[PDB]
Ligand SMILES: Cc1cc2nc3c(=O)[nH]c(=O)nc-3n(C[C@H](O)[C@H](O)[C@H](O)COP(=O)(O)O)c2cc1C
Ligand SMILES: Cc1cc2nc3c(=O)[nH]c(=O)nc-3n(C[C@H](O)[C@H](O)[C@H](O)COP(=O)(O)O)c2cc1C
Ligand SMILES: Cc1ncc(COP(=O)(O)O)c(C=O)c1O
């Protein structure tokens with residue numbers, strides 16, 4: 001029996017490395033640098049990140065969402081408040097975020113608590129979104145099973161007509177979450193599978209920082 | 215206060231769509247097609263997937279790993295058996311896998327139970343790995359905190375000398391997991407945030423298939 005073709009897919013990572021002397025006191029400083037370099041390398045969706053949530057049975061779920069804001073208080077993403085992730089977050093606020101920057105031979109993983117954004121900040125953001133996107137927010141009962149795509153298309157045309165030139169109101173079931181920064185791991189690929197790993201861990205007000213074996 | 219620059223990063227997805235009539239009876243048939251198209255579009259790491267595990271406190275963790283094999287019995291990846299993920303899996307076998315194919319405006323997410331590969335199949339695979347990688351497997355106590363990178367480099371040279379031309383044995387703490395296929399979601403981006411979503415759910419021997427609102 002021969003190995004599957006994919007068993008042979010592999011790549012040595014020689015773009016760079018990460019040493020303790022390269023680390024800033026604030027993890028967000030390094031994240032900002034990396035994000036900036038991702039935007040410059042021209043990744044298709046530099047702000048795309050995978051958010052993992054856990055349901056009531058201890059089962060993890062994942063889906064990509066976009067990072068739309070970040071500061072010391074956490075990383076932000078917008079979503080339908082009636083969705084599977086939102087319902088999972090309701091019961092277990094613990095989440096994980098992963099920026100899949102492996103084309104740049106890097107990973108950034110964050111652990112923290114997800115909490116709802118205020119209606120106010122959501123409104124601010126909602127009105128900067130493309131008009132068809134605002135309508136679409138109204139159309140989709142995110143995560144719920146639907147009979148066919150026609151249901152969405154029909155509803156979209158219906159709502160577009162209804163909203164005719166006026167402002168599309170913010171649906172009460174559309175909002176977002178702010179994920180606190182409890183831990184942040186940075187990964188930079190290396191050779192011989194000996195990558196660089198540094199984990200920032202919130203310890204009271206400061207950050208405990210350790211290198212983790214690859 | 216102006217919105218952060220990233221608040222404005224967004225993309226409309228018009229590469230394609232996914233209709234119920236395009237769905238094969240076996241989800242792996244569609245996954246194979248998509249994977250094939252990812253290898254052709256030349257994604258940097260087409261087999262890279264994000265695996266999420268959950269620790270004993272209900273906290274999710276993520277890290278990328280490579281898909282090295284897959285068939286009806288599940289998807290396979292190799293890793294250090296003493297690592298954080300392996301320890302988390304020990305207590306909670308429930309995992310989630312996500313192929314970040316958003317440059318192709320797609321996502322494939324799998325839910326299932328992670329179980330250990332047999333020593334036998336691991337050996338088979340371990341000996342097809344580059345020699346420096348086999349040594350590296352011995353060097354790194356994956357996930358454990360280490361004092362500095364020098365510790366790894368030193369150990370690597372030490373083991374390389376020790377193994378001098380002979381076969382690098384399979385470390386007892388290096389192996390892999392097979393993730394069963396309980397559910398598999400396919401996502402294909404659309405316009406106005408009205409994407410196509412189909413969830414395959416194992417129901418006894420067959421697959422229950424539903425379109426999920428975007
Ligand atoms: C590149 C990309 C960006 C996405 N961004 C978001 C987002 O910011 N908010 C959102 O609700 N869904 C977003 N999605 C769709 C989600 O992946 C997911 O399908 C949806 O939120 C429903 O997940 P849920 O059923 O777990 O609640 C994005 C998908 C991709 C591939
Ligand atoms: C493109 C890419 C492929 C990777 N593949 C693997 C893999 O197949 N097995 C592995 O153990 N680690 C792999 N890693 C490293 C993991 O992301 C992770 O850092 C490591 O397994 C330790 O995770 P843990 O501490 O949660 O146990 C890969 C990283 C990247 C960015
Ligand atoms: C730590 C680690 N182990 C294994 C792999 C891939 O499996 P293999 O080295 O046999 O190609 C990777 C790929 O990035 C990795 O980072």
Ligand SMILES: Cc1ncc(COP(=O)(O)O)c(C=O)c1O
Nearest residue numbers: 066078079129133223224407428
């Ligand atoms: C369902 C959904 N909501 C929101 C977003 C992105 O936020 P915004 O539409 O305001 O750019 C995406 C991006 O892909 C999405 O798929």
